[PDB]
């Protein structure tokens, strides 16, 4: 499954991933999250 | 390696006395036996390097390092014969099989070509091929079942296709003259007809009873071959009918309050009514005067059970099949 609603786990992992990778590499950040795409991570931020 | 795989294998599972225990789950050693899809596999060779080695198997090198030869060389055989000593009357006449001129990969893909198929006289698992044969008209009338020999031994023991299994039926006939009961009714001995097979619909869903469902739509319509464009350079089908556009079109010839949302049954279930009721038949009369006639191991017998089924059917009085005669 590559969809769903954003949970607290995913939001915290997204913020730590953004802290490590920055705001211009959403594919690395989306590699961290199992159910979310680079576009969905970018839209969530 | 070596010591580590051995002693952690001994530590994880001394209990596998028979066979071989699985390799240890560690970040150091790899689990070679586990499945690793096809979009995760790496294409490696016997040695174990990511490298190909054929002209037609994707390598930049073929043969023994771009050479038609080999490491061992090749030596021809001697062959001498005459009138006094001939080759054809020799005791060990070594014939010329087309397999000493083959390489190991020739033998490998030759036995790869040697597929396994079940025999024609015995049905295998899931052999789904008779449906297109039967639904062909005259072709299905002429072509018959491929005489799987269980059927023909059933024919041998007295069975016929078109009717089922059971005791003999003493029904007269249907002559096809309507439903005339004025026939003499002398009732030859017949066989029971076959019950139809149950073909249950596939239930992959939790849809309720009687629901036809939301109907689904359909897509709007829709010297032999070429060399090919490669399996990676194909992308998607950028090699169509080179002459004319489009897929060919099929051508027509001519132009108490109950629960909410729950309905009440107007008539009760008959057997939730007869559970209170007495039934459709009375108990027997039971007149006075009748009295009861009588007043108020298995394993060991199975050990001594030497009765063969022939004498068992003889003492039980059951008719037997005819044997070899």
């Amino acid at each position: 499954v590559k969809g769903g609603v954003w949970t607290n786990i995913e939001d915290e992992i997204l913020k730590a991933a953004v802290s490590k990778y920055g705001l211009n590499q959403w594919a690395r950040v989306s590699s961290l999250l199992a159910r979310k795409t680079p576009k969905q991570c970018k839209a969530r931020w | 390696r070596a010591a580590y795989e051995a002693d952690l294998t001994a530590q994880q599972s001394p209990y596998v006395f028979f066979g071989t225990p699985l390799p240890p789950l560690d970040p150091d050693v790899r689990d070679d036996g586990s499945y690793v899809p096809i979009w995760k596999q790496e294409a490696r060779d016997e040695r174990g390097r990511k490298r190909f080695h054929g002209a037609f198997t994707g390598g930049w090198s073929a043969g023994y390092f771009n050479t038609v030869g080999s490491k061992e060389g090749w030596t021809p055989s001697s062959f001498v014969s005459s009138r006094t000593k001939r080759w054809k009357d020799d005791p060990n006449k070594v014939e010329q099989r087309p397999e000493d001129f083959m390489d190991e990969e020739d033998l490998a893909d030759l036995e790869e070509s040697r597929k396994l198929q079940t025999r024609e006289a015995f049905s295998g698992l899931g052999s789904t091929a008779d449906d297109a044969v039967r639904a062909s008209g005259l072709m299905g009338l002429f072509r018959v079942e491929g005489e799987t020999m269980g059927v023909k031994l059933l024919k041998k023991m007295g069975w016929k296709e078109g009717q089922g299994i059971g005791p003999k039926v003493r029904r007269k006939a249907r002559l096809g003259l309507g439903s005339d009961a004025n026939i003499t009714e002398e009732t030859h001995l017949f066989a029971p007809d076959n019950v139809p097979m149950i073909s249950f619909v596939r239930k992959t869903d939790h849809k309720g009873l009687g629901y036809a469902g939301e109907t689904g739509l359909t897509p709007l319509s829709k010297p032999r071959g070429s060399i090919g464009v490669g399996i990676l350079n194909d992308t998607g089908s950028d090699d169509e009918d080179p002459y004319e556009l489009g897929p060919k079109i099929s051508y027509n010839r001519v132009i108490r309050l109950p629960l909410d949302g729950f309905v009440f049954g107007k008539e009760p279930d008959p057997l939730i009514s007869e559970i209170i009721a007495e039934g459709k038949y009375p108990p027997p009369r039971i007149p006075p005067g009748w009295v009861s006639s009588k007043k108020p191991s298995t394993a060991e017998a199975a050990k001594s059970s030497t009765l063969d089924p022939r004498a068992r059917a003889a003492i039980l009085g059951e008719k037997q099949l005819p044997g070899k005669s």
């Binding site: - | 939301e214 689904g216 739509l217 897509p219 709007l220 998607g236 089908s237 950028d238």
Partner: protein, 49 residues
Amino acid sequence: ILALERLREAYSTKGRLNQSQREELALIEQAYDSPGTTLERIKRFLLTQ
């Protein structure tokens, strides 16, 4: 019906599609299988979103 094949003319049957094209193909096949819910979703989006 017509709209679906227009989108499906954009993609050959074979190919190296990335994620979004296969998501689109899944949505198109879902629309073929369940057209009433797809049309109701389209009208809801067209009114609301």
